[PDB]
Design an enzyme around this catalytic site. Structure first.
Site, PDB file in Angstrom:
ATOM      1  N   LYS A   1      21.128  12.505   1.609  1.00  0.00           N
ATOM      2  CA  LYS A   1      20.552  11.069   0.965  1.00  0.00           C
ATOM      3  C   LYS A   1      21.731  10.017   1.308  1.00  0.00           C
ATOM      4  CE  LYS A   1      20.368   9.891  -3.367  1.00  0.00           C
ATOM      5  NZ  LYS A   1      21.452   8.329  -3.167  1.00  0.00           N
TER       6      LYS A   1
ATOM      7  N   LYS B   1      31.438   1.967  -1.347  1.00  0.00           N
ATOM      8  CA  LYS B   1      31.154   3.179  -2.122  1.00  0.00           C
ATOM      9  C   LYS B   1      30.814   4.201  -0.997  1.00  0.00           C
ATOM     10  CE  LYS B   1      29.870   6.171  -5.258  1.00  0.00           C
ATOM     11  NZ  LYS B   1      30.897   6.992  -5.832  1.00  0.00           N
TER      12      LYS B   1
END
Ligand code: NA
Lengths: 290, 286
Positions: A237, A168
């Site tokens: 992030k 991912k």
């Protein structure tokens, strides 16, 4: 029967499909009003996440970040999930967070399945998205028929509970690189008197005719990063999770360093409310086009 | 048919293009296997030029093009003459040559091609055109025989060359991001093949990712399609082009160093795809 924790932009449509497909859901969300469209579809709502858990049952979670998953999946909640219980953890989080939590699940005989989703909310409703699974084989075999209802592809990355999470992060890293190389390339063209739209149309019509480049390329061409699909600080992030993950296995990521600086510099420029695609504005800044 | 065409340069792309034009009925004066299909060969390129005619050129680099298109030859091409330049060269070389062409009343068309030899043979490739409007009107029907898409980038004779360099840059970036990503996966105990298969059958499902991704996944940069040093030459043209319009290209700087370091490691005879070995070297896997 199935506990479903976190009903944001992805949790809501995912839960709607599992209700449509005949599964009974007991749902929860930090914001209690988000669950009322699911109560009309047959689901039940609870005030506290632990009241949703069935010993030996299935719990899905989809939350914003690593701290949200760790705060919710306390030892006492995982202990209630207990023996043969299965947690399908769909949040985009660090492999390390997944491996740590998976370890805690095994203390109580439960199984953690890393199950990050490759789908924007529209792709979920259209069931054209994909999922990666990693963790215990028996637990993946139990939930694979459930997740087939809201995705096209199911990819298995083996026993390591954090392996799918690596895929991912790698996927999101490649999306961010695509944005950056288009920013650079379209700015070079622009400063050569060529319209950004014309170079975009040519290159994505042919060589770069994949959904990432056609959808994200239009944003970079117009250099309009409104409306927001993913908020700008969230890109930072995500690239920082990638950099930490790569550093921990002694792997430099030179492109990811550049992406990180685009977000840091963009925040210095007051771009926190734009879409994460606005990382591509850095190339315009550097070429004096602000 | 009416147009007796000068075709200068017969390499990997030049030969299949000339073939399609010979099969489409065009009369060609090239500069031996095309004589078989109906062409005529000449020893000095200037003798292939007809005043006011059409000349195609596809040559290996900027040097090869400027050396061939001398003041003499361009003057011979002369009034209403059209030069279709299909080499991957810098926009600056195209713009400089174009001024030479119009001093003698000729027209230069920048026409770099986006196709592997097999895409040419199938008429599946694309071409970008830029330069004089009238000249492009004359040669578009001729180029439509060996390409699928024709993209017009206007009057600037070097604008199509910008698109070509940007395309090659984006291909190199794609090789580098797959090198980085697949090496991160690899060092996390995940096979390069499994990450490759998932990402290039979903998010990155375009032949560029599936074809180069296979090479990066196995770190086998075969067969040699484009020699490693040509990758450095191409990324250097992009960097020079970008610098002349005051545009930094941070990913291109990384790409350049992958080639310079590969040449330090003796990789001059590998395919340009081997720029992706850099990520493996830096992660202690070579
Ligand atoms: Na499905």
């Amino acid at each position: 029967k199935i506990a479903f924790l976190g009903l944001g932009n992805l949790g809501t449509p995912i839960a709607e499909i599992l209700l449509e497909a005949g599964y009974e859901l007991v749902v929860w969300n930090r914001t209690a009003s988000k669950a009322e469209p699911l109560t009309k579809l047959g689901a039940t709502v609870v005030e506290n996440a632990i009241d949703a858990i069935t010993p030996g049952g299935i719990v899905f979670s989809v939350l914003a970040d690593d701290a949200a998953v760790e705060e919710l999946f306390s030892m006492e909640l995982v202990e209630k999930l207990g023996k043969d219980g299965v947690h399908v953890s769909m949040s985009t989080i660090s492999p390390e967070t997944s491996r740590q939590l998976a370890q805690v699940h095994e203390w109580y005989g439960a199984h953690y399945v890393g199950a990050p989703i490759f789908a924007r909310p529209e792709a979920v409703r259209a069931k054209v998205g994909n999922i990666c699974l990693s963790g215990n084989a028996g637990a993946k075999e139990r939930i694979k028929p459930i997740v087939e209802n809201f995705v096209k592809g199911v990819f298995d990355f083996g026993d390591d509970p954090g392996a799918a999470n690596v895929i991912k992060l790698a996927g999101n890293f490649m999306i961010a690189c695509s944005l950056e190389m288009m920013g650079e390339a379209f700015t070079m063209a622009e400063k050569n008197g060529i319209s950004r739209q014309s170079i975009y149309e040519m290159l994505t019509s042919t060589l770069f005719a994949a959904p990432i480049f056609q959808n994200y390329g239009k944003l970079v061409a117009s250099n309009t990063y409104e409306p927001v699909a993913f908020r700008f600080p969230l890109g930072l992030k995500d690239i920082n999770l990638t950099l930490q993950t790569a550093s921990d296995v002694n792997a430099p990521m030179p492109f990811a360093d550049i992406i990180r600086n685009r977000f840091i510099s963009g925040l210095a420029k007051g771009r926190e409310n734009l879409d994460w695609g606005a990382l591509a504005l850095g190339a315009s800044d550097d070429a004096g086009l602000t």
